[PDB]
């Protein structure tokens, strides 16, 4: 699915990442962890154009294809996701509205027919059904004691109603125990087989929560160390923990 | 179309609007200025919709009804508006088609027909005109030194094609994008529209000249009059206000 | 929910609605209103699929389906309905019988379990008790005086037995308060939040209702539309004699 | 079969029948002629019992019972027809399916065998044969150029289908088509057997130069004043009263 070799990426004319390499095949739940700003989030910044950092090396391959040639929004249609976030007051223009908008900008992409507002409310009622969510997650309020985990909500819930075929997570940012609660547990109900995650963390403790399938140590724009799940003790045995 | 009668807001239960009034009547163009953190900008918030302004006290009366009880959305459609930023690139989807979607939930706001994407584009196209503006002004991109007047550009833009009976224009935040904001609002100007501008200097006013012009200080409207208002101040040696 | 774009339709050769649109979705309660010419009954007879009304422009969808190419009786299947008459009397057969087998045509047609004559008739209890209405609706014969609210019981106990998800009712009858007021209750007593309503009506009915919108028909065209408070907007902007 | 003695009617107070005497037998057609508003109408009217009006004096006796203590059902079940319309669009319920179920709620009241769907479509089939009728009669439709024709065709099948021994035809409409007045006088002579009768009215026209009635009666001024044979309408064409 997605073969990166030899990536090197700049932001604001400074070296981040250096070399990275990694390979990541359907069905796959990848953790990449490690000391912060040593090229945790450029990295999945850099598989969705969004910001605009500059390559100066390596490949990065997406099903064959140059990934690094699409934009943003093209990228969106190859497959690659990475959670956003809901226009603000536009007339007209509800979050579900626009998640619905989002659906069918893909699969027109892709070239398939898109959802009209009743088989997309269907679509809505399931996955939402699926993922015990709030029923009115789109329209919904919360005080702040909530804002942590609800912004994630959201987040899987784009996951669960765009049909991605890779999806980046960028779950690095206040030690909320019930945000990374629903992170893990979205991941887990969108784990069928074909689909890939990258999720990306400092943090290390979601990863006794949802069991990745690998786990990369990242390093000053490179990946040390990877292994299974059980990467993390074979390193605190071999006298590596600090890792 | 809009009274304000001693207005109170509160942000985060913090005292921010102390008791603000204000009047606007149809083919006028108000200034509001003042000291940074005077509550300026919390008034145009107040005006247009929350994130978390509680109004603690007073009226806003916008053509007869009341304002506060309304949605941001809703009051775009009853015709009191503030430039929205467009949603994220989505691929195949231009902005094109957000500015169709405001401009019909408007529409059926107020109780006319809806438009196609023909008769849509139309509209646009005719503004667009108007406003002389780069005919691809919804797709295309700038350079970074370009950021900010093309931000000013679709707004305006907004401006023209869901014609709002009043427009909030909050700038506290670029010659170039003076410019535009300066001479849109010269263009949408018809004698029936109205205008609140929250300017933090004076000078854009140089370029569109208001009927008023307010100082806020402390949360209130301390100071009003015509354009004069500004150089009287500056004699009597209160530049900074 | 349900979409009506550019609708043209003729009757007697004659044109009557003109490019009329309208969307209509869960939850709302709509009211037509207008002179005797802008046919706001035509309007409610081509939506429920009356067999004398041509299209000749325009488009009816519902959930998402062509509307027009379906018979009156798929229609209420889909959730489309608007009162019947019940059929000329014959003897030891009740009116019962016939609403029982409207709920089992429209059923069927949503793939479901059709009922039997005990559990129809215990529903139909049900729905009585609930409506608070004579026991002996569909049975009993009425004093003169009172047929006009009998009627429109009646097609209030329909739509409640028969749970349309858009509402059609014609209110442009030949003015009195009795049915009216029956009219009013049933509709409040219908509303749950997701069924919706269309109201086609010549004059007050309006304010024991408050719609969610108001529609005024000009000749086959829809022109102002809005809030209950247009009503009162167009009476106070001069415009009094658009409704009524 | 049917005795007729001494009857008076009013409608909405005003009197049309005043002591109206008349005796149809097993195998008689009559045909009732006069001017229009005249009673005739109303004497239809009166017999099948829809919507019917204030007998205030008279008898009416059928098959040796007091017809007017009937239901409008009950006579039908006591064997009087008049031609009906189908209800329309409840879901459900076409055509077919109501005539079916008009016929076995008459053969119920009778006490015969009921009909299921099988045997049913026979009977049907088999009359649509007898009458030479349309075999989609009951779900087609046409222009109104044969408008007229076809609501007599539906009229003269229900007649066939019911098994009625006394039917009663209102034919003292106007602007009526030759092509519908001869639907209905081919229909009465192919369920002419001789054992059910049939009272017409029809002055408002000339179907009679086509069956040949047995009687013809002269209503006017709300009594049978005159009445003969098939050749009455000569006698009278023939003594200036034409005009009656």
């Known amino acids: ?3 990166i070799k030899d990536l090197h990426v700049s932001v604001e004319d400074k070296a981040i990442l250096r070399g990275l390499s990694l390979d990541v095949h359907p069905g796959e739940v990848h953790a990449i962890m490690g000391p912060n700003g040593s090229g945790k989030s450029t990295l999945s910044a850099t598989l969705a154009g969004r910001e ?3 390559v100066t090396g390596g490949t990065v391959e997406f099903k064959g294809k140059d990934l690094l ?9 190859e497959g690659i996701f990475m959670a956003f976030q809901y226009p603000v007051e536009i007339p007209g223009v509800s979050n579900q509205f626009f998640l ?3 659906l069918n900008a893909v699969r027109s992409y892709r070239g398939q027919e898109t959802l009209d507002r009743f088989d997309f409310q ?3 009622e399931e996955k939402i059904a699926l993922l015990k969510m709030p029923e009115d997650l789109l329209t919904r309020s919360v005080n702040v004691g909530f804002s942590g985990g609800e912004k994630k ?3 899987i819930l784009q996951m669960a109603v765009l049909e991605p075929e890779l999806c980046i997570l960028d779950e690095s940012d206040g030690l909320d125990i019930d945000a990374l609660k629903v992170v893990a547990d979205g991941v887990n109900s969108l784990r069928d087989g074909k689909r890939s995650f990258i999720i990306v963390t400092h943090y290390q403790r979601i990863l006794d929560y949802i069991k990745p399938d690998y786990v990369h140590v990242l390093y000053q724009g490179r990946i040390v160390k990877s292994g299974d799940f059980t990467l993390v003790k074979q390193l605190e045995e071999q006298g590596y ?3």
């Open 1 to 3: 699915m997605l073969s």
């Open 100 to 102: 619905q908008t989002a």
């Open 52 to 54: 605009d950092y500059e």
């Open 69 to 77: 040639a699409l934009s943003p929004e093209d990228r969106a249609g």
């Open 122 to 124: 269907d679509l809505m």
């Open 153 to 155: 909500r959201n987040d």
């Open 241 to 243: 923990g600090w890792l």
